[PDB]
Design a protein around this ligand. Structure first.
Ligand code: MG
Ligand code: MG
Ligand code: MG
Ligand code: MG
Ligand code: MG
Ligand code: MG
Ligand code: MG
Ligand code: MG
Ligand code: MG
Ligand code: MG
Ligand code: MG
Ligand code: MG
Ligand code: MG
Ligand code: MG
Ligand code: MG
Ligand code: MG
Ligand code: MG
Ligand code: MG
Ligand code: MG
Ligand code: MG
Ligand code: MG
Ligand code: MG
Ligand code: MG
Length: 212
RNA sequence: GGCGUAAAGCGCACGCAGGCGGUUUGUUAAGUCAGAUGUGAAAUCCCCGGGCUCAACCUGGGAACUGCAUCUGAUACUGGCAAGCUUGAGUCUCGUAGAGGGGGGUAGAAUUCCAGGUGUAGCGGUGAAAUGCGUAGAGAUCUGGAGGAAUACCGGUGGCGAAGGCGGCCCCCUGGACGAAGACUGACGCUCAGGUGCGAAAGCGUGGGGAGCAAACAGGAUUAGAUACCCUGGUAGUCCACGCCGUAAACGAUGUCGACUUGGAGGUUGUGCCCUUGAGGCGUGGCUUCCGGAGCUAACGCGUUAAGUCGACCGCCUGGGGAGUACGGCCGCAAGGUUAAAACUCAAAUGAAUUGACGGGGGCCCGCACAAGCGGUGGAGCAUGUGGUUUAAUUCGAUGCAACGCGAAGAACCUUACCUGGUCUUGACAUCCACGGAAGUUUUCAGAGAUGAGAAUGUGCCUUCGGGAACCGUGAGACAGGUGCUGCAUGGCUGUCGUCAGCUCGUGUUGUGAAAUGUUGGGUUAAGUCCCGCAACGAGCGCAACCCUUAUCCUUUGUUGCCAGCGGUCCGGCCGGGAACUCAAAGGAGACUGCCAGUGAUAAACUGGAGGAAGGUGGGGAUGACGUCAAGUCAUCAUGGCCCUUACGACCAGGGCUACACACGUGCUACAAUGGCGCAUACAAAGAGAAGCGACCUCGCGAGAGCAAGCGGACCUCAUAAAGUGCGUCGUAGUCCGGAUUGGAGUCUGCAACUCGACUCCAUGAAGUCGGAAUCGCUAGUAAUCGUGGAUCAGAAUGCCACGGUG
RNA sequence: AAACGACGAAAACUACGCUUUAGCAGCUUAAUAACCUGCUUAGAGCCCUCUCUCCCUAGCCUCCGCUCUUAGGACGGGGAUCAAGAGAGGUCAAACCCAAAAGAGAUCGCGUGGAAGCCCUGCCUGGGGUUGAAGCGUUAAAACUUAAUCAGGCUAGUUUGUUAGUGGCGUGUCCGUCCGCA
């Protein structure tokens, strides 16, 4: 192991949590079990939709999952029927009634999860990894990101020996703890194994710490 | 085309034939140049046309047949002839330097022997030793004598010589080179296949010489072996004269001569003139060294002494091995030399340079890596894991540093895969289904249970009622399943170098090009941290900072946390009350080389100090680059093929992971008078608690048992911390030391501790009595020594992870 | 052993889409350009949707649950549809935001005085205690009140001990003179 996960090293400084609630470990295990279940159900359901992230709040005898996505229209549906359809299942899985929020994410090519997504789809549909990564990094640089670093490893191009390629633009200060280093992972299930993809997006230096 | 380095300059010099040849005139016109004639067969090629329906094919003419012979001219060049000239070349006259060669003499240093004197137990030698020399007087010292070789300093990138080569001094003969001025000789000039001559050392023959050195050889020594490197002796040889071979990295790996083509710093040796006041200056020659411009080269490098552009000549090269080998001719007393192949094999063999890596290469620097400690490990039981052993299994993985108190943060069945026994074939675990009943709640037997039967039963909520949740049973089919394998297909995660300080990119520049600068060099540092200088200018990953804890102060708000001041007391924070404090957890100030001197390059930076709780990162943690190790996990999980579907899949009972001769690793108890023992007695922090922590009373010698209040926790518990401190007691002891083994009977948790936890009593009292080679961590609240909490956990730490006491 | 790597010259997820300008930025000797561009300002022609502009109604609730209930509200239902238009969006359900009260005391819940069991006590007569067991009423009332009865046929006379006529397997199989439990 070389690099630690850049999210949980600055979660207490500049980055927000993906789950906001409290427990006295009387129900902590079941709360995360419920959070894991709802997260995996949402990920399995909203496959076509480009879901950016899933934040969960758990107030007293209620929950609130605020999904952030790039294209919210598919999840919304006509007259807001699909959200009502997929809200009851979440509510009954979590026990307490739910209230699902949906947030559109501006600049869909500047989110770590979004940029890590659909590159696996390109690999599945047999798009060359080098050109795919180059297009992703150049689009992210053009949109406004100050630094982008993309790594792709494992059975690239259906070869015989796996390797690890990477591209980098601008600056990616992974060691500093006063910058947005939003990072997410994704995997592709090709015809000759599994390919791992990692993306680091440095946007700026957040002075002052948490709460802006 | 090339010959400095890949293959290619004879080792050098002379020189015959031959090749070439300064300058002017006249003559000849042989080559050469112009024109004409004959011939150069036909055929063929080419060009223009035609015929075969096109083409192939045939055909007419033209051109061509690049050649030869003859005739008529041209005269610049080459050639022949005759006259001239000095600029090429050679000679005279005078000086200059020189280890140039041959021959003969002379003088010391030094080594070795002979003889003598003084003198006693060592000398010599090696990383260390011995062979060797010594009491028969060694080594050392002094005297005289014998003999051989070379001539310390001068002595240099100095001189001479064609090359080889040449070093005291003197004499005799002689070759060669340069310069000042002077006249003639008049092309007499350069090279050279054959040929001749010289030719390092080693080698051979004859006749001598032989001090030192030294092949062969003898002995000692290291090493597994050492026919060597090392040591002690030692023959040929090295020396002289005449003879023989003609080999070298005979090297400047560069064949001889001519002229042309920028410069600087010298060395040696002449010569002209200037006031020669110093090895003062201005010119001109000969030899030679270093740097370097243009130019050349694949590059290194050459660079007026070209490896720059030419001219004349000779020799050599045509892939690496076979091989400069055999045969053959010649030379030679011989060794051998010279001229010099062929068959067969190979896809390369090569040289200059570039980036890494290595060196028993050099320079500089850092880290408990050594040095100065301290304590332990290895010695003897005790708790663990690994290897092998045995078994049916001792389930599998990790197998150097980076595996061995590892996954496992804790195996009686559970976990659990392995084995012995029994059962199932859509399954324990999903989706699609046709039905019959909601389920479900007690229960009887067989059985170790898995599951085989049997019952009293429930008759749950839902529309038009062939119903739906939902539950089970039967029949399959896809399917489910694998801790089966492939981490040499992988994703993800992790260890190591290493918290070392380096790793790269953009532009520019340099070299054709791999590539280099930037990144090196000088200070400086914890550091690619900074500065300076420099074809470098900037940036990214990086070394730091931002992040967490703690070290001081201020403020905000005082309960469950505190008592500066007062009142009472049940003397206790008890509570009224007091919000300064100890403290609680939020925001700030605060240490930033900031300043003062010295040092340094007028910097960077370093040393000391007035201040501060703090000083150069104040003290710790997190943060672990490019990348290396087919590094470890397909048994956390996912994933591509491969494997089984009556079995590698599914369920249950009992055993095994904890095991008979051992070794290894990491820890604990210790060894004793620094100590254990009996009775009083203070000083902490951090954490846990809801079928859990568990106050008090009573039985208990005891683990604990009935009773249990309080506590989702600054309230109540876990939980009078130990070391120490007070007093006795033990006197260096098979010990009042170590509690390992073993027997008896129990206490708590767990359907159930025989295989296999721990605590408690009684007794028994193994070793040991400071540990061999070789080793491990630590530089300050650190190493040692003492106790406690917490993780998974029904119970199980001597392990792991953190607080503290002393230090 | 082994290990190379050439074409979004398949702009390929489709944001309604397509426009001009306004300025930053890459492009550069230098100011335009092609755009490489993410926005910001403007108009919507338009493919689209929603409140709609139709009428009737006063549809308007909200504190106390409900009952004509008051200040006030941004407050409010049915029906087929459009010519043009006033605003929001682009496959927008909530959230962020903006708000709730004067009522009056009509009622199920909610609280009732002579009643079904449980206390020596197991069957039970047990009122002695009590409710939604019987009269009764609003955010409140006509209030009001779940254990302590002794003792009885009460395991029923042969069950406990004086005690035997046989309606008895007795004793590996036992026919079994006799022993042995009632
Ligand atoms: Mg050639
Ligand atoms: Mg050569
Ligand atoms: Mg060579
Ligand atoms: Mg030569
Ligand atoms: Mg020769
Ligand atoms: Mg002629
Ligand atoms: Mg002619
Ligand atoms: Mg024709
Ligand atoms: Mg002809
Ligand atoms: Mg002539
Ligand atoms: Mg002479
Ligand atoms: Mg010759
Ligand atoms: Mg000789
Ligand atoms: Mg000798
Ligand atoms: Mg010798
Ligand atoms: Mg001789
Ligand atoms: Mg030779
Ligand atoms: Mg040579
Ligand atoms: Mg010559
Ligand atoms: Mg010379
Ligand atoms: Mg040079
Ligand atoms: Mg030969
Ligand atoms: Mg060595």
């Amino acid at each position: 192991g070389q690099k630690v996960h850049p999210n949980g090293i600055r979660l207490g400084i500049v980055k927000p949590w993906n789950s906001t609630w409290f427990a006295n470990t009387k129900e902590f295990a079941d709360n995360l079990d419920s959070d894991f279940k709802v997260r995996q159900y949402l990920t399995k359901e909203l496959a076509k939709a480009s879901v950016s992230r899933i934040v969960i709040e758990r107030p007293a005898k209620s929950i609130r999952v605020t999904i952030h996505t790039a294209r919210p229209g598919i999840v919304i549906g006509k007259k807001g029927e699909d959200v009502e359809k997929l809200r009851k299942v979440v509510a009954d899985i979590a026990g307490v009634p739910a209230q699902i929020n949906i947030a559109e994410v501006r600049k869909p090519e500047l989110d770590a999860k979004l940029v890590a997504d659909s590159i696996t789809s390109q690999l599945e549909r047999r798009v060359m990894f080098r050109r795919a990564m180059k297009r992703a990094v150049q689009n992210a640089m053009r949109l406004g990101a100050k630094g982008i670093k993309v790594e792709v490893s494992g059975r690239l191009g259906g070869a015989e020996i796996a390797r690890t390629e990477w591209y980098r633009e601008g600056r990616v200060p992974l060691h500093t703890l006063r910058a947005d280093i939003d990072y997410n992972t994704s995997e592709a299930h090709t015809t000759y194994g599994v390919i791992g993809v990692k993306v680091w997006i440095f946007k700026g230096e957040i002075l002052g710490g948490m709460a802006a």
